[PDB]
Structure of Sodium channel protein type 9 subunit alpha:
Amino acid sequence: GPQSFVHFTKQSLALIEQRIAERKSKEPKPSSDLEAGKQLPFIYGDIPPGMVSEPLEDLDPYYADKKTFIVLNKGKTIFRFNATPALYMLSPFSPLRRISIKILVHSLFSMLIMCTILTNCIFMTMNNPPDWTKNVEYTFTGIYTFESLVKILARGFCVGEFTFLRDPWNWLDFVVIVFAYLTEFVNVSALRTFRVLRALKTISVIPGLKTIVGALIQSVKKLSDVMILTVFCLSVFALIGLQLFMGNLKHKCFRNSLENNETLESIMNTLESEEDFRKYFLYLEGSKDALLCGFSTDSGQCPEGYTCVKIGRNPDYGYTSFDTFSWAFLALFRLMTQDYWERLYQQTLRAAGKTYMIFFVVVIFLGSFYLINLILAVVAMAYEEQNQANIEEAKQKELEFQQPYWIKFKKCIYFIVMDPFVDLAITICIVLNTLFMAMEHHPMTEEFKNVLAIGNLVFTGIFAAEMVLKLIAMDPYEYFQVGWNIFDSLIVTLSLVELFLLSVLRSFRLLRVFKLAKSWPTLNMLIKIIGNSVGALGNLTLVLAIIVFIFAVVGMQLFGKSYKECVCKINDDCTLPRWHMNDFFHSFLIVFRVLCGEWIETMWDCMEVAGQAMCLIVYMMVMVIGNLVVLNLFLALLLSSFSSDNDANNLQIAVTRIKKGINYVKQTLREFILKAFGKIWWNIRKTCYKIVEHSWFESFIVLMILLSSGALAFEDIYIERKKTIKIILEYADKIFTYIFILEMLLKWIAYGYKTYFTNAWCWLDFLIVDVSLVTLVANTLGYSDLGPIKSLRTLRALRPLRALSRFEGMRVVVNALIGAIPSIMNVLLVCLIFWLIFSIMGVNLFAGKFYECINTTDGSRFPASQVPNRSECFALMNVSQNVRWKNLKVNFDNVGLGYLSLLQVATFKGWTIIMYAAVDSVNVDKQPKYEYSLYMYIYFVVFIIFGSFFTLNLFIGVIIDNFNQQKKKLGGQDIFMTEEQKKYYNAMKKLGSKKPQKPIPRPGNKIQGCIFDLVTNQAFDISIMVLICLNMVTMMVEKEGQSQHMTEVLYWINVVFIILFTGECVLKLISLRHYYFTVGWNIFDFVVVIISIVGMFLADLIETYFVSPTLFRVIRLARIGRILRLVKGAKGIRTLLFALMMSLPALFNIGLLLFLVMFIYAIFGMSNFAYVKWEDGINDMFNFETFGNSMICLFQITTSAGWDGLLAPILNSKPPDCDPTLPNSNGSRGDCGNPSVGIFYFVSYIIISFLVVVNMYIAVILENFSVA
Ligand SMILES: COCC(CCO[C@H]1CC[C@@]2(C)C(=CC[C@H]3[C@@H]4C[C@@H]5O[C@]6(CC[C@@H](C)CO6)[C@@H](C)[C@@H]5[C@@]4(C)CC[C@@H]32)C1)COC
Ligand SMILES: CC(C)CCC[C@@H](C)[C@H]1CC[C@H]2[C@@H]3CC=C4C[C@@H](OC(=O)CCC(=O)O)CC[C@]4(C)[C@H]3CC[C@]12C
Ligand SMILES: CC(C)CCC[C@@H](C)[C@H]1CC[C@H]2[C@@H]3CC=C4C[C@@H](OC(=O)CCC(=O)O)CC[C@]4(C)[C@H]3CC[C@]12C
Ligand SMILES: CC(C)CCC[C@@H](C)[C@H]1CC[C@H]2[C@@H]3CC=C4C[C@@H](OC(=O)CCC(=O)O)CC[C@]4(C)[C@H]3CC[C@]12C
Ligand SMILES: *[C@@H]1O[C@H](CO)[C@@H](O[C@@H]2O[C@H](CO)[C@@H](O)[C@H](O)[C@H]2NC(C)=O)[C@H](O)[C@H]1NC(C)=O
Ligand SMILES: *[C@@H]1O[C@H](CO)[C@@H](O[C@@H]2O[C@H](CO)[C@@H](O)[C@H](O)[C@H]2NC(C)=O)[C@H](O)[C@H]1NC(C)=O
Ligand SMILES: *[C@@H]1O[C@H](CO)[C@@H](O)[C@H](O)[C@H]1NC(C)=O
Ligand code: NA
């Protein structure tokens, strides 16, 4: 009981030695609430005042027998030691031991350690430490020695059982202190790096961090199977890309204009440097890489006079290659993370042909889309079950816990403040303020600036008046009692500080919008999430901040001097690049960018200056650990808040009274106005009704729509030359229109006007036939070349939409997407206003500053030393012709352009040139300077954290809640599966969960008996598995440029492997006696061995009978079938692959709809952008001139990769960039682009594709939760 409090005495020590004597004469877990480091049970009451900081005997009966004693704080936390003297000298009663306990057992000691640690972290971030910091370093070493020595004196070193080194966290202290004195007593980067380990001590000293890091480790522990699958899949696809693309990125066009007997070999002998490479090969302007080339008809066709020859290095400094298995693995990992993969995709297609788009499609679907889903689902399950355990433990803990003139003036003015009118007036003024500050733009006249300024003066007037009036209406002591009032006070007093006599300060007016949270339910949820970011979940956010700090400082210490000294090898003018790790801030930015998803481009430079190894380990550590922590935080916010939600408001009072008033006047004026004052037709009906419902009509009509939609794809820029096909297409178009008109008439007659017109699908078909009629009559009358009718032409691209109602897959998927529109619209409004705040802030900061004065020959901004003003560039234009004062196309000149720039930043596409213009901006009409505004990166960091991370978190939560609501409103069935797919899906459930088959019969024949016993055993299976892994290795051994001897060797080893696997299959045939074919995996074995032999014969036929290397490489892929068999044994890999097989139907439906959307946008893009100028992505190979070339671009940007590069040439609309009078083969003129259609096209596309792929994400992840 509570009485069990007694001092630790030497008499008690005698008692201890004697009862341990008893236990030794004759010769239980520790309590879950009595272990050290937490709070003592409340049943024992409070401590005697003479007992704090004094040794006590252990309360646990299990620990009452061994050597131990407990010590308490004033904070009443418990620490336990062992009774054995420290190192066998310091008895627990010496002066040293209890002074060490007193110092160690204290809150002030821990606080001192925390402050000195954080000061040390502040001192780590010094690029060039001043010489005087040595003494400060010695000081820190002194405090760390003091704290260590206190721990040894209080606990011993290792002699006992509970002592200094027993817990792992003290090992870090020991290592750092011994390494500090090692460097003190005795590759400066190597020594200076290991001091970052003290930054890890915050995890030990700040409370709660221990459990957070333990939780992260436990979450990792579950990723074993998924990491094995990831390695397996990346290796298999790396071998596939090895076989297909080995050496193609070596192709370069070579100038045939070489004279004086210099042939290809005569130059081969002398190609070692890069200057001679630039002398003889083709380098597109502004590129460090030689332009690729190919041999197929669909590859990169070299210019005239250039021959395409595979010589020289691979692109990107050598690092983009599918030559050796390591480089292929790097490429497939860059494809799985979709990091700048839209450049590898373009190079691979340019050098190998547009026909490996299928390779990239299957890699993107399987590599990126699926493995990431698996990772997210497993981490989510880990966190969810851990959270359930925590909640259940907390609940159990709760159950155990339970078991004169001024006064009348003030009250009258307070009455002037009534909830209905004052609050709504203030809300309206807030909304008008935000809509009034949104009228700022760069080209502005004094009139409009003046009205803006006076309006802002008025609004700050009303808000200050409100603040003073609520100051005096209710006592200032009580004004501050609520958070909203103090928030508003801070806003007002800061706006007055503005009115005293800064650009960032101009915009904190915008925060008063958030006061709308009380009325608006969904904005309040964003407030809740941002609050959890620092509230219930502040420890995890603090872990994340600490890790980003440590990675930044580690990378800086390792690579700063490397970046500085080897600067000339990553930049041509021999100055530091834009992204570097020379400073703490720039290394922080690189770490942040890697956390955003951008890691290949900076690692190329890292490895250029600091060598491959360290760069790879450090970058992959950052990737894995940082992405782990960020994903954990995101999932925690999501689950916590959307399971959290799982006096009347002042606006509600206003609605009440205003409804009272409006209803009162409405019905009283209502009272005022009352007081002041045929068998044949229905035969046709039935016959048509069975006609339209008859199956052949439906199938014919679906075929008809498919044919019209397909005919849409031929009208490309080569339809003039195809004389025959043109006539067929136009005649067919007429027939299609007539058929659909007849279909509409038949359905009209058969169903009736109301029935046909109460259905939305018929509304779609009706609008389409209407526009076809319009264009038909306009063609007949002769007004074909009128512009509006020429535009109604392009609307023929909407024809594929007729298919949505005929196939049930996109019908059900569209039903779900439509059921989700309201919630999507609420979230979109919240995001719209949030990004509106950020867009007005960006317009205040940057509007009109992105202008610059350039050499148009190379695009080089002039030095700001000369030509620093706009007038200076105009003078230069006057004196030198080819000079331009150009602005960025996507900029912050107004709130629309601000929202386009924010959309580019939030998806990290095009965002870099935006930030370079931001940080280099000086002021309006002044030329930008290199990182003049260096700390404007923080605007983008804050926008990415808030408008991107948190809004996406809110969107995901609302979508998940909406989809589970739909699933419950359907009774618990699936929402992307038709009836037949549900039936199949249940069937494949039954197949997968099959009870094991009965044991195979035992053959009677004796030699059959021996072979059967041999083959049917574990050892045979393990032997085959080891052989398959060995064959995998001998496949990875292949490289590019290998000598013929190694080729023959690997050929023979592969032959041997085919021999042994054929032997295994033959012994299986003989021993199981056609029962081989019963078990499913043996059919796969059979197919693998057959295709292995057939491919091995066919290839050797190819190099001797029909010599074509491409077909050779395609058939030689049958080797890869052998590798597939490793999934035979792994019980987790199968489960995951069976999850994929389970989820395939829903993905088929969603991908069908996505494909139809891509088809529609491809027809539109061919109609509109087929003649835009070739700039920044639109080139000879990647354009909208053909259906293939359009759908290639649309697949590229279905992942939103590089859409900023396709949109850029369309934004050209004027003669300085584009050219509006240029003869074209369509009959039109100009290679120009109109921005409005381009912006609508790309923004819409990325939004619809985002919605659809998020739907795929939800389907797959819920499938994984269901199966597991
Ligand atoms: C407390 O008990 C709750 C239980 C119901 C549990 O339902 C779960 C269904 C799976 C689901 C929706 C849940 C939590 C984490 C969710 C994952 C977090 C990741 O977030 C994402 C999207 C957002 C990205 C930023 C990160 O990845 C998804 C890929 C991943 C995710 C959305 C896949 C789906 C997961 C809730 C009922 O108990 C009675
Ligand atoms: C739902 C919320 C988040 C947005 C509501 C729409 C408006 C409040 C915003 C969005 C687009 C903004 C407009 C973007 C473009 C312009 C053009 C601008 O005038 C010019 O650029 C003239 C240029 C010239 O004369 O050369 C004036 C501000 C204005 C109207 C902005 C006013 C504020 C607008 C209309
Ligand atoms: C904030 C600045 C940039 C002006 C932007 C426009 C807003 C004033 C509009 C857009 C969204 C509208 C809100 C949409 C949703 C709501 C919630 C509505 O109340 C509920 O929905 C209660 C639901 C429930 O209790 O379950 C009150 C109106 C309100 C705040 C609307 C108020 C007017 C809003 C905020
Ligand atoms: C010709 C161009 C210039 C303008 C075209 C405008 C139409 C696209 C608008 C006007 C009437 C609207 C329709 C009004 C009625 C309906 C029925 C509605 O379905 C129902 O109401 C079902 C009700 C039920 O089942 O109980 C679906 C939307 C729809 C097709 C609307 C779709 C959009 C329509 C066709
Ligand atoms: C803009 O750049 C171009 C090319 O970079 C300059 O034109 C020539 O540049 C070369 C450098 O390789 C000089 O040797 C020539 O003398 C330049 N020719 C002329 C006519 O200038 C051009 O000078 C640059 N513009 C300005 C204003 O300096
Ligand atoms: C912007 O242009 C120049 C760029 O330095 C500014 O400086 C003037 O330059 C002219 C021509 O070199 C000199 O004659 C003047 O003496 C410079 N000004 C001064 C104060 O020395 C010029 O002032 C700027 N003009 C505007 C309108 O901003
Ligand atoms: C071949 O190259 C040599 C250079 O040593 C040159 O003298 C000779 O004329 C060349 N032959 C022809 C046919 O151009
Ligand atoms: Na990159």
Notes: The radius of gyration is 37 Å. The chain is about 65% helix and 0% strand. The longest helix spans residues 357-402. Residues 821-969 form a domain with the Helix Hairpins fold (CATH 1.10.287.70).
